[PDB]
Swiss-Prot record, chain C:
EC number: 3.6.1.-
GO CC term, one of those recorded: centrosome
Database matches in PANTHER family: CHAPERONIN
Positions contributing to Mg(2+) binding: D87
Placement of covalent cross-link Glycyl lysine isopeptide (Lys-Gly) (interchain with G-Cter in SUMO2): K207
Subcellular location: Cytoplasm; Cytoplasm, Cytoskeleton, Microtubule organizing center, Centrosome; Cytoplasm, Cytoskeleton, Cilium basal body
Per UniProt, location of the Glycyl lysine isopeptide (Lys-Gly) (interchain with G-Cter in SUMO1) cross-link in this chain: K414
GO MF term list: ATP binding; ATP hydrolysis activity; ATP-dependent protein folding chaperone; unfolded protein binding
Name the UniProt record assigns to this protein: T-complex protein 1 subunit theta
Species of the source: Bos taurus (Bovine)
Residues modified as Phosphoserine: S11, S147, S273
Catalytic activity: ATP + H2O = ADP + phosphate + H(+)
From Swiss-Prot, chain D:
Leader peptide range in chain numbering: none
Record protein name field: T-complex protein 1 subunit alpha
UniProt record similarity statement: Belongs to the TCP-1 chaperonin family.
Entry-annotated residues carrying N6-acetyllysine: K22
Compartment(s) of residence: Cytoplasm, Cytosol; Cytoplasm, Cytoskeleton, Microtubule organizing center, Centrosome
Quaternary structure annotation from Swiss-Prot or TrEMBL: Component of the chaperonin-containing T-complex (TRiC), a hexadecamer composed of two identical back-to-back stacked rings enclosing a protein folding chamber. Each ring is made up of eight different subunits: TCP1/CCT1, CCT2, CCT3, CCT4, CCT5, CCT6A/CCT6, CCT7, CCT8. Interacts with PACRG. Interacts with GBA1. Interacts with DLEC1.
Parent-protein residues present: 465 to 534 of 556
Biological role: Component of the chaperonin-containing T-complex (TRiC), a molecular chaperone complex that assists the folding of actin, tubulin and other proteins upon ATP hydrolysis. The TRiC complex mediates the folding of WRAP53/TCAB1, thereby regulating telomere maintenance. As part of the TRiC complex may play a role in the assembly of BBSome, a complex involved in ciliogenesis regulating transports vesicles to the cilia.
Binding site for ADP: E33
Swiss-Prot record, chain E:
Protein's name in the database: T-complex protein 1 subunit eta
Keyword field: Acetylation, ATP-binding, Chaperone, Cytoplasm, Hydrolase, Isopeptide bond, Magnesium, Metal-binding, Methylation, Nucleotide-binding, Ubl conjugation
An individual GO BP term: protein folding
Subcellular location: Cytoplasm
């Protein structure tokens, strides 16, 4: 989001939207946990900027808490690759504006 | 005259965008429910009358009647994610949808498709730049390893003894480690006990 | 009850006239576009999903699905005209329609159909008398030959090489025209390179089948066979004793008959059409030897050149340089099958036109010139012939005005203006005056070169006339379902 | 079309003489109209467009 | 009664041109998006599932269910464009359709078809000529060629290392430089590592023989075998008695068979794909044998280096250093398939440009730079060429503005602002000013190093233009069901 601002052009709104799409994963956690996705992100985004990103969403205690302490770590390749794959595919489809399929 | 015969489907203009949006968003919303330890399981009963209670997206999409091209694509994302590392087969699915869910917005604003890919590309390239920044490079560290393994054996049927599975995983990888080769690891499976 | 059974479409008097005339008009106008260098080809595709891109009216009608009685009469007019000289195939069509059109208008007024025919028939004989007097006799003579061949090559897709197709057809029809016959001309459509590569081979070309055999035989002793070479030694051995270094079998040849003919250094060719065998017997002097036991040395024709050329990348035997080669072969070359098709279609025409010369030197300045003249003459003739016929005669001529009308039509030039001008300048510049499409304006066809065959026009008027007349008489015809 | 070619060859004084039907020298012919007419013609016609293009919606009601 | 049966839909006059024009325009539009570096791919499905992602018009028009006459013609044009120069397939298909869009507003008014052909044919000629008068003839030289490579990779995902890749392209093109046959330069994409690892192999490389076998053997004596090496010792002995120290069995190799292979010191891989088997044949120069007993000394190819490295954990064999490596393999390494995929696409094109550089010298400013100029001059010639041709030629020039128009659209930039911004900068700078889509703004191609063979534009104009003339000429469509 902040980098989207440091770089104008129509790509600005794009980066912003991209970021908004990076909040779904968390929002979903709160969703599947039972807690209101919105009210959750409320405490998240807040407790996150204050105590570094080392804090996430504890679907077990319903709320925010330091993940590093809850021992909820995940390889970098997991997230890393995740963004990639999803990004690459979605991109392809975006370039698809016509499909003639006979039979 | 008749360019395309019958039994087809031609998506032109915003028709192509829309279709994919509603088609993917849906498939993305389906898996999204099975995300996290609280993930909601699904039952995929094909036409043979066989039950399929799985929590993995790839296992759900591999049994879901996917006729739309867009949906099939989402099926190749979880399959690819599941054929490489496997873990998070759900994420990629939900993630892909979200992005598209947002994209549609920019589209209805008059923003051309190609452009949307651009921003999402630069942003992603930076998304990693940051994720690779906050990371805390793990240490032959017996402590962290056994931990990471337990974060993969959780919310599963092997969670009741994720400790034993992780222990074996660590030693197995540490032994054949030299750059670690997954081939030097023989997984013998037999009934009993 | 019902006068006639079921499924029997009938038409009486005018009712029939309108239908017949109408159907003929649309059919005559359809091909009308295929006239002059502005000829707009058409794409007809039969059941077998076959695409035919031709400018020749006859080829069009003989490929179109016509079920209309009167309309079929037009297919006949174009058929005969195509069998007579070829050129003017569309001429008859359009004209035939115009006639019916002018005639129908006469009936609706109250005029008797009888008089119509009489007036038209009488004017048909008058014209056949005017043409021979006005015609411009030309000089054989390679100089005059190329002139007529040069005016018969244009108006087509191969107009880019009207100079080559002119000399090619000028050489062929000038090597064996005793009394020339369009059947002694074999045209081959070989793909590869532009038409500017077309060659003239003094003989007959085909495709051999054996390699080890003599690809280029000198004074060959051709032996045309028709009986299969299957069983093979005594058959091929009896061919080496006669001295036949070139075997042209009609049917298939056994592999053992090929290896033997391949060992005797005898160039063997299997799968030879029945016509290619006859053309090889009248070019080298070979005898159609049925069985493989009766052949001798007096049954072998002489062919000084029988080599294997791979022009365009396809093997072809060239039996050229004979004692009395009565049949030559036109080696056509095209970059595409499309261009190759059009070219050949026009080549044949020129072959017929040349055949018209060998039996008619006379020629007229085409492009509508002759038409306008006849119209002028015939019209005046009508005024000299009293009676209601004076109207029919003048109407007949008014039809000839449809030819130049179509000319300026396929060019986008206001007929009303070009016609009026044409006549005026024609009544002063005489016969020669015509219409030059390349440059919308009156011009001397004789000077422009545009010269058509007298005989080509002659038949046209007669055939078209008699035909149209017939379709007009049968004004009542149910059927018998 | 012919007018354009003859309009940039024999200068301005080249218009269409409907009477004859060919690009003729109206200046030499005598065909002259007070420039004021041309001005008003354009001015009015122009303003006429701008207005209609300035219309996105209206309300006449019966 | 009734000319044609209930099925012979007769479209004459104008209702024929129109229909054929509209469809052609729409078909072209379909591919009109696959134009440019960021084209819009099309996942063509064959009803049976198999989805094909293509960006080339030809491949697309050949995999689509075409059932329209005027439509099947477009497929021909694309095929005639793809088999002539290659790229521009989508262009020629779009232009031909567009040329039918600018004439339509004239037909509906009464503009005769033939006349229309005149201008169009006259314009194309005038345009083609200019291509030979405004074409910049450039120079070989590893220095220049490398430049022509960086310009082919720039403004792309590979631009990050276009410096290294550009070199590989030049060398790969220099090595096998005997009119460079793209069907000899292989590209091997394998995920694992970084683009900074990709190298150019003087032969081929495939994706073992035994754990620790001769990883890097000096001069190998390639021994290819189609049959499997399983039931054994009899076959292995035959390979040793031939001098074959390197064998590649297409099918799996016996467990024990592999043993005697590590004893006789002979590298031998099992389960070698058919395609790969052939590659090695065109690489080191080894002959493919089905049986192990048919393997002789004259069947053992030769290479300089043969190493087995684990590029990404998976051991890979390399076949570099061929006497006459007339079939190289560009080994590519990267993080994901995507990145690697794009890479295989950037290099592919890069090789093209470097190729056309050694061949045709006369080039031009791409990015629709030539179009903008042509459209300019053509408009001028309009004034010089009065009458019907005038207005037409102008519209013809207006059409050529579609190449740059859609060019910007295939990225997300406003076509208007750029088009106008181009005509301005073009009429001030030179015939080099085009549209750098990668930057969404005008720029000089001479400096932007954006060039393309003079042939390209030429092969497109004629072919594309003449096509329209066809649909225009044929003023009637009959089939006869």
């Amino acid at each position: 989001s902040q980098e989207a601002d440091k770089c104008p052009t129509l790509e600005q709104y794009a980066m912003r939207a991209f970021a908004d799409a990076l909040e779904v994963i968390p929002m979903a956690l709160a969703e599947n946990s039972g807690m209101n996705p919105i009210q959750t992100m409320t405490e998240v985004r807040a407790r996150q900027v204050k105590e570094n990103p080392a804090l996430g969403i504890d679907c077990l205690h319903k709320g925010t808490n330091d993940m590093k302490h809850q021992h909820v770590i995940e390889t970098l390749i997991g997230k890393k690759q995740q963004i990639s794959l999803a990004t690459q595919m979605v991109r392809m489809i975006l370039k698809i504006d016509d499909i003639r399929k006979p039979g | 005259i008749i360019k395309d015969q019958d039994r087809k489907s031609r998506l032109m203009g915003l028709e192509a965008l829309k279709s994919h949006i509603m088609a993917a968003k849906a498939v993305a919303n389906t898996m999204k429910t099975s995300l996290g330890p609280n993930g909601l399981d699904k039952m995929m009963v094909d036409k043979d009358g066989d039950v399929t209670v799985t929590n993995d997206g790839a296992t759900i999409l591999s049994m879901m009647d996917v006729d739309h091209q867009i949906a099939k694509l989402m099926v190749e994302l979880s399959k690819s994610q599941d054929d490489e590392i496997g873990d998070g087969t759900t994420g990629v699915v939900v993630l892909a949808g979200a992005l598209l869910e947002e994209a549609e917005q920019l589209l209805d604003r008059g923003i051309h498709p190609i452009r949307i890919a651009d921003g999402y590309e630069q942003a992603a390239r930076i998304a990693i730049e940051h994720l690779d920044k906050i990371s805390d490079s793990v240490l032959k560290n017996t402590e962290p390893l056994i931990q990471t393994a337990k974060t993969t054996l959780g919310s599963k049927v092997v969670n009741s003894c994720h400790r034993q599975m992780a222990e074996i995983a660590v030693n197995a990888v540490l032994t054949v480690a030299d750059d670690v080769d997954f081939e030097l690891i023989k997984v013998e499976g037999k009934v009993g006990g | 009850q019902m006068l006639k059974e079921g499924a029997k479409h009938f038409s009486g008097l005018e009712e029939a006239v309108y239908r017949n005339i109408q159907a003929c008009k649309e059919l005559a106008q359809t091909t009308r576009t295929a006239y002059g260098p502005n000829g707009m080809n058409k794409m007809v595709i039969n059941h077998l999903e076959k695409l035919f891109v031709t400018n020749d009216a006859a080829t069009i009608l003989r490929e179109l699905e016509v079920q209309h009685p009167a309309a079929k009469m037009i297919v006949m007019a174009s058929h005969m005209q195509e069998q007579e000289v070829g050129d003017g195939t569309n001429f008859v069509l359009v004209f035939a329609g115009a006639l019916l059109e002018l005639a129908e208008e006469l009936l609706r007024l109250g005029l008797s159909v009888s008089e119509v025919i009489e007036g038209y028939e009488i004017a048909c004989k008058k014209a056949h008398e005017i043409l021979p007097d006005l015609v411009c006799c030309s000089a054989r003579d390679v100089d005059e030959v190329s002139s007529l061949l040069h005016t018969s090559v244009m108006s087509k897709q191969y107009g880019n090489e009207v100079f080559l197709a002119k000399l090619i057809a000028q050489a062929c029809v000038s090597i064996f025209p005793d009394h020339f016959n369009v059947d002694n001309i074999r045209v081959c459509k070989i793909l590869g390179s532009g038409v500017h590569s077309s060659s003239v081979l003094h003989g007959m070309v085909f495709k051999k089948e054996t390699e080890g055999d003599v690809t280029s035989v000198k004074d060959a002793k051709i032996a045309v066979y028709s009986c299969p070479f299957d069983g093979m030694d005594a058959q091929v051995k009896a061919i080496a004793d006669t001295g036949a270094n070139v075997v042209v079998t009609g049917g298939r040849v056994a592999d053992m008959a090929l290896h033997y003919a391949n060992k005797y250094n005898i160039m063997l060719v299997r799968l030879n059409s029945k016509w290619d065998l006859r053309r090889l017997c009248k070019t080298v002097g070979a005898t159609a030897l049925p069985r493989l036991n009766p052949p001798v040395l007096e049954e072998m024709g002489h062919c000084d050149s029988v080599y294997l050329s791979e022009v365009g990348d396809t093997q072809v035997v060239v039996f050229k340089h004979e004692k009395e080669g009565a049949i030559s072969t036109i080696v056509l070359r095209g970059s595409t099958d499309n261009l190759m098709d059009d070219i050949e279609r026009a080549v044949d025409d020129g072959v017929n036109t040349f055949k018209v010369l060998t039996r008619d030197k006379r020629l007229v300045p085409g492009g509508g010139a002759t038409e306008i003249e006849l119209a002028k003459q015939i019209t005046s003739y009508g005024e000299t012939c009293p009676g209601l016929e004076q109207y029919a005669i003048k109407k007949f001529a008014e039809a000839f005005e449809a030819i130049p009308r179509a000319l300026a039509e396929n060019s986008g030039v206001k007929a009303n203006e070009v016609i009026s001008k044409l006549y005026a300048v024609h009544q002063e510049g005489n016969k020669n005056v015509g219409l030059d499409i390349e440059v919308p304006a009156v011009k001397d066809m004789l000077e422009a070169g545009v010269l058509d065959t007298y005989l080509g026009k002659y038949w046209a008027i007669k055939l078209a006339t008699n035909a149209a007349v017939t379709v007009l008489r049968v004004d009542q015809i149910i059927m018998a379902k | 079309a012919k007018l354009r070619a003859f309009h940039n060859e024999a200068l301005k004084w080249i218009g269409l003489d409907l009477v004859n039907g060919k690009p003729r020298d109206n200046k030499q012919a005598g065909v002259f109209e007070p420039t004021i007419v041309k001005v008003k013609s354009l001015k009015f016609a122009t303003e006429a467009a701008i207005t209609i293009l300035r219309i996105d919606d209206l309300i006449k009601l019966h | 009664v009734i000319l044609l049966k209930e099925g012979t839909d007769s479209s004459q006059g104008i209702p024929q041109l129109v229909s054929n024009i509209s469809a052609c325009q729409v078909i072209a539009e379909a591919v009109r998006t696959t134009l440019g570096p960021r084209g819009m791919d099309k996942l063509i499905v064959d009803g049976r599932g198999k989805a094909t992602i293509s960006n080339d018009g030809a491949t697309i028009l050949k995999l689509l269910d075409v059932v329209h006459p005027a439509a099947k013609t477009l497929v021909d044009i694309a095929k005639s464009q793809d088999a002539e120069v290659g790229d521009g397939t989508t262009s020629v298909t779009l232009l031909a359709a567009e040329f039918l869009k600018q004439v339509k507003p004239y037909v509906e008014e009464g503009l005769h078809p033939q006349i229309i052909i005149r201008a169009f044919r006259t314009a194309t000629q005038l345009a083609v000529n200019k291509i030979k008068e405004i074409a910049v003839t450039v120079k070989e030289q590893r220095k220049l060629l490398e430049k022509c490579a960086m310009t082919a990779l720039s403004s792309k995902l590979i631009s990050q290392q276009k410096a290294f890749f550009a070199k590989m392209v030049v060398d790969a093109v220099m090595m096998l430089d005997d009119l460079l046959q793209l069907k000899m330069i292989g590209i091997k994409k394998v995920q694992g590592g970084a683009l900074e690892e990709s190298q150019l192999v003087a032969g081929v490389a495939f994706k073992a023989g035994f754990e620790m076998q001769p990883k890097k053997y000096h001069n190998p004596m390639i021994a290819l075998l189609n049959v499997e090496l399983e039931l054994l010792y009899d076959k292995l002995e035959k390979i040793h008695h031939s001098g074959a120290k390197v064998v590649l069995s297409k099918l799996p190799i016996g467990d024990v068979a592999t043993q005697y292979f590590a004893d006789r010191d002979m590298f031998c891989a099992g389960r070698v794909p058919e395609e790969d088997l052939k590659r090695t044949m065109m690489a080191c120069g080894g002959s493919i044998q089905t049986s192990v007993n048919a393997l002789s000394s004259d069947v053992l190819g030769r290479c300089q280096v043969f190493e087995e490295t684990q590029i990404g954990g998976e051991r890979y064999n390399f076949f570099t250093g061929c006497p006459k490596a007339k079939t190289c393999t560009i080994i590519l390494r990267g993080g994901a398939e995507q990145f690697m995929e794009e890479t295989e696409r950037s290099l592919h094109d890069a090789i093209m440009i470097v190729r056309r550089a050694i061949k045709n010298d006369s080039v031009v400013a791409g990015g629709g730079a030539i179009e903008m100029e042509l459209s300019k001059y053509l408009r001028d010639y309009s004034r010089t060429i009065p009458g019907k041709q005038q207005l037409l030629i102008g519209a013809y020039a207006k059409a050529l503005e579609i190449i740059p128009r859609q060019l910007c659209d295939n990225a997300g930039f406003d076509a208007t602002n750029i088009l106008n911004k181009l005509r301005a900068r073009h009429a001030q700078g030179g015939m080099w000013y085009g549209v750098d889509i990668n930057t969404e703004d005008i720029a000089d191609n001479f400096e932007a190093f954006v060039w393309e063979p003079a042939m390209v534009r030429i092969n497109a104009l004629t072919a594309a233009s003449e096509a329209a003339c066809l649909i225009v000429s044929v003023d009637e469509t009959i089939k006869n069901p």
